[PDB]
Scaffold this motif. Sequence first.
Motif, mmCIF file in Angstrom:
data_model
loop_
_atom_site.group_PDB
_atom_site.id
_atom_site.type_symbol
_atom_site.label_atom_id
_atom_site.label_comp_id
_atom_site.label_asym_id
_atom_site.label_seq_id
_atom_site.Cartn_x
_atom_site.Cartn_y
_atom_site.Cartn_z
ATOM 1 N N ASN A 21 0.758 -1.074 0.028
ATOM 2 C CA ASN A 21 -0.009 -0.010 0.017
ATOM 3 C C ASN A 21 0.800 1.291 -0.165
ATOM 4 O O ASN A 21 2.177 1.110 0.147
ATOM 5 N N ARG A 59 -10.528 9.662 -0.390
ATOM 6 C CA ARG A 59 -10.949 9.429 0.799
ATOM 7 C C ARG A 59 -11.794 10.893 1.186
ATOM 8 O O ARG A 59 -11.400 11.736 1.439
ATOM 9 N N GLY A 86 -8.971 -1.366 -5.281
ATOM 10 C CA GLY A 86 -9.732 -1.743 -3.843
ATOM 11 C C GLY A 86 -10.387 -0.635 -3.367
ATOM 12 O O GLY A 86 -10.300 0.565 -3.259
ATOM 13 N N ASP A 109 -12.309 0.870 0.157
ATOM 14 C CA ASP A 109 -11.919 0.618 1.680
ATOM 15 C C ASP A 109 -12.532 1.630 2.487
ATOM 16 O O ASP A 109 -13.069 2.615 1.947
ATOM 17 N N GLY A 123 -12.157 3.710 6.364
ATOM 18 C CA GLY A 123 -10.957 3.772 7.407
ATOM 19 C C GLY A 123 -11.620 4.555 8.462
ATOM 20 O O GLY A 123 -12.645 5.768 8.146
ATOM 21 N N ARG A 126 -8.825 0.215 9.727
ATOM 22 C CA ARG A 126 -9.237 0.371 8.093
ATOM 23 C C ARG A 126 -9.376 -0.937 7.345
ATOM 24 O O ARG A 126 -8.474 -1.843 7.618
ATOM 25 N N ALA A 127 -10.497 -1.185 6.774
ATOM 26 C CA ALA A 127 -10.737 -2.561 5.994
ATOM 27 C C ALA A 127 -11.199 -2.168 4.526
ATOM 28 O O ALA A 127 -11.263 -0.878 4.183
ATOM 29 N N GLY A 128 -10.998 -3.214 3.720
ATOM 30 C CA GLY A 128 -11.418 -2.964 2.529
ATOM 31 C C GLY A 128 -11.570 -4.255 1.645
ATOM 32 O O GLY A 128 -11.351 -5.355 2.040
ATOM 33 N N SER A 132 -8.589 -7.826 4.409
ATOM 34 C CA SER A 132 -8.098 -6.543 5.185
ATOM 35 C C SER A 132 -7.577 -7.414 6.862
ATOM 36 O O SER A 132 -7.605 -8.401 6.880
#
Lengths: 299, 76, 79
Positions: free
Chosen positions: A23, A157, A206, A208, A210, A223-225, A260
């Motif tokens: 990332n 974001r 991706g 995501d 956060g 944070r996930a995705g 994630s």
Amino acid sequence: EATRNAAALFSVDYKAFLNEVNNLNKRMGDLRDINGEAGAWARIMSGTGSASGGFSDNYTHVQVGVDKKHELDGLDLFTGFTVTHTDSSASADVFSGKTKSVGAGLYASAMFDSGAYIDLIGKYVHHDNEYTATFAGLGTRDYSTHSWYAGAEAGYRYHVTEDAWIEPQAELVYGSVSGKQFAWKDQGMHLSMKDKDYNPLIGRTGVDVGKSFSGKDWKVTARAGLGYQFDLLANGETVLRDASGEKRIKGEKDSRMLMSVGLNAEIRDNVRFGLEFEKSAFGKYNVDNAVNANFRYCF
Amino acid sequence: SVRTSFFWDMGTVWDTNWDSSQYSGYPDYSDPSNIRMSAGIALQWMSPLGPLVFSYAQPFKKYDGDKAEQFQFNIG
Amino acid sequence: YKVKERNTGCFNFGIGYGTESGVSFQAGVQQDNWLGTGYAVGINGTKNDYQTYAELSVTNPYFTVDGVSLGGRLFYNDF
């Protein structure tokens, strides 16, 4: 056979490259909420895995770097350099070898007043392996290849909530790595296999979400995705020969999935903590990943 | 909190409970002669997690199987 | 005498989970000047599928006024 091991050699190297590719909000530091435009960022990761047929590997790559800029008219354009060092080791049914990959390059970062995030990095590396294989009768050999890999990543974001916001992101790295040429004539038969310069490329899109948590009691990075990875270019073509005849093969695109990480939190600047995820998908091709969990407390 | 050095290292180790006439072809492991050498740069930093030590050097001398990790890193 | 204190010895706690060696366990401390009492105390240990290790150590440097030191330790391992 011996040629099929070469596909595993690329497939294993693909995962290492997939391990090498990471990332931008972890390896290159968060492109937002960073008030020191002159300074360093870094990240070190370690993992392992395996596939069907007994082919297993374990790797660890650590990268650092610096950047230097100042404020502009709404755009956080910063530039700098970076270096990275990775070590890996793999074993299979009829072969095994260990390798390293060290490289250096330059990066740029861009955060806009509207809330956009963009990162770009590019590295020249000299990755060298030393492996023994008796398939085709060649034996033990060591070889180094130069990887010129440049990768970008973009995302938006939007401040959905001050503590939780959905983030769309998409990354892609294209690299040039030349092939290898060797003949097993030391065993008596040529069986010459050759591959010229290759220009592979792989990206991952991706989406995501956060969470921005603070107060030093939580101070977490939850944070996930969900992302899908496609090999934009797979030019790892190799042509092998034999007494009966000569055959050809080449790399192919991918449509892999991922998951994630859990907590990756910390308390204060004295201490640290994190948790990792191992995506072990035995159902696909007996694939697996390796993860860790460890924190620090210092008086 | 930081300290950098340029270092030149020398080392050797051997056994006395060894015979060579018992093993002509097998190399001797009782000779104080294979003196391994190395040289490079090293750094220490008392970070707010402990004494972090990093180093990069090259073994200007080596013998037998002396697989070398060029860059070394540890705490304490 | 004006002095500036510094950190000395620190805690750690690592539970590494994987396929080989499974969820291996590890923790311990290693610090002299225990809570300022001036002792030297170090406990460490790891739990692994095929390797269990533990060690405990204590040492008082000024057991008497003159400065004799009394220390001891225990260690257990199976590999």
